[PDB]
Amino acid sequence: GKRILLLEKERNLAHFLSLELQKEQYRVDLVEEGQKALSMALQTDYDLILLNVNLGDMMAQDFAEKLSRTKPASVIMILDHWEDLQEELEVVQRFAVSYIYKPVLIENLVARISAIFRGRDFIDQHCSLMKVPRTYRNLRIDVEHHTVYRGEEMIALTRREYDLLATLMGSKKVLTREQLLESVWKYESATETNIVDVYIRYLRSKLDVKGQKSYIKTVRGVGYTMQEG
Amino acid sequence: GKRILLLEKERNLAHFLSLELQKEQYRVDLVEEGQKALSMALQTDYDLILLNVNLGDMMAQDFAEKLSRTKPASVIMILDHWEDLQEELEVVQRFAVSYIYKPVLIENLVARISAIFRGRDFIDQHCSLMKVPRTYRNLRIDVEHHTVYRGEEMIALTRREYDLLATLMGSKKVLTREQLLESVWKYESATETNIVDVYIRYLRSKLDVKGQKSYIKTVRGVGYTMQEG
């Protein structure tokens, strides 16, 4: 459950925004004083802090600079009317992840907050996009359908097998059993590298053709890679 | 929101398992018939299908074989008692992404499903295999706290600045503004390439030092990348 700190000076809006955010299963701490919002953000890591340009007892810009002393990458979004935001736009753009104008439909606001959260979560997986190979010899990879064809024949690779093939095709360098573990079984706390050899064998038995070189190369030393034909 | 097809013969466990999965914001379709489970799996793409070894009107092995005609990389996990799973283990190991024994703690099962999901997403987003970069020149990245140090000095990068620096550091290649948009503003629908240039300048003003090369390299007419010292 993502945690949100909410200081909104229009109490009617605050109430209904809080309700809709909770409907999305976010946790909402509603607050009303700048200095108490700051003390709360210092002691609690919020996934999002939603503020107006002027908090009452301080400006959002001062809130953000103070907080930044210890939590410099804090996720702050500003919600305000046109004139208030326009007057401070340049500074808001510096400290705020995003800003949105009142008057505001709550659903558009909740939608923007969800986008920010997804975008932050994507950065947090350290996913460096790389170009995907879609052929190898007479194998065709249909990435959108997670299907594989040998010539025109669909090969019914399971998910794990599909994943193993893609990991091998994705690396020019040979991969160790350990690197394969950390790839195809990433996040699962897998220990035995012996399961790698089970699934190589499953993979070969689906792909390889008799009289032909195997599509998978065993580098007896180190690990596995794809087998040039 | 990840979608799960759940056919568990023990209705008490099924009920609580469904609730705990929903708390992670997963959508759970509870079923009780193997034939209905199959018809649902053909007509909608589930991220995970959770089954016992025997579905009642058919074996999970038959379910998987029929499904694999259309959807060969379907994500199927088997939950069952020792004797049921042991008796079918070799077969299950071929068609199932994973298996887990009853009696089972719900919290353990949710954690394993979540891991499997993240593992599929790493493959499906074509993330590089390389380790997240944590240094560049005299920069140190504390990934857990989203903080950055230049020497011993903490630089107060904003979340957006941080995400941008991470995306640049994440890629050996030059990134175009369109690529930077699609990663640092992923899901935010941004279409103005101009904002990338604005945050590059913000990043430089925080990191760069007089009489040093900039940490960021402008590649005229292409995009941006990191700047060797």
Residue numbers in the entry:
A (entry chain B), B (entry chain A): 2 to 230
The authors write:
Here we describe the two-component-like orphan response regulator RitR (Repressor of iron transport Regulator) as the archetype of a novel family of peroxide-sensing transcription factors in the pneumococcus and related species. RitR contains an Aspartate-less Receiver (ALR) REC-like domain, which retains the common (α/β) fold of canonical REC versions, yet lacks “invariant” residues in its catalytic pocket required for typical phosphotransfer, including the phospho-accepting Asp residue crucial for the histidine kinase-response regulator phosphorelay.. Here we show that RitR regulates pneumococcal iron homeostasis in response to cellular peroxide concentrations through its single Cys (Cys128) located within the linker domain of the protein. Atomic structures of RitR in its oxidized and reduced states demonstrate a dramatic mechanism of activation that hinges on the helical unraveling and subsequent formation of an inter-protomer disulfide bridge to enable DNA binding and transcriptional regulation of Piu.
To observe structural rearrangements after RitR oxidation at the atomic level, we purified, crystallized and solved the atomic structure of native wild-type RitR in the peroxide-induced oxidized, free dimeric form. Because the individual protomers of RitROX were sufficiently close to the RitRC128S structure, the dimeric RitROX structure could be largely solved using molecular replacement (structural statistics can be found in Table 1). At least in the absence of its DNA target sequence, the oxidized RitR structure revealed that its individual domains do not change significantly upon oxidation with H2O2. However, the relationship between protomers changes dramatically, whereupon oxidation, as predicted, the DNA-binding domain is released from the α4-β5-α5 interface of the REC domain. In the absence of its interacting DNA, the final result of the free form of oxidized RitR produces an unusual domain-swapped structure, i.e. where the DNA binding domain from protomer 1 binds to the RD of protomer 2 and vice versa. Importantly, the RitROX swapped domain structure is possible due to the effective unwinding of the C-terminus of the linker (α5 helix) to free Cys128, enabling it to form the inter-protomer disulfide bridge, and unequivocally showing that Cys128 is responsible for dimer formation. Aside from the Cys128-Cys128' linkage and the adjacent Ser129 forming a main chain nitrogen bond to the hydroxyl side chain of Ser129' in the other protomer, there are few observable electrostatic interactions between swapped dimers to hold the conformer together. However, a comparison of average B-factors between the RitRC128S and RitROX structures revealed that although REC-DBD interactions appear almost identical in their 3-dimensional atomic coordinates, there are major differences in their average residue B-factor values, where the RitRC128S and RitROX structures exhibit average alpha carbon B-factors of 11.03 and 36.25, respectively.
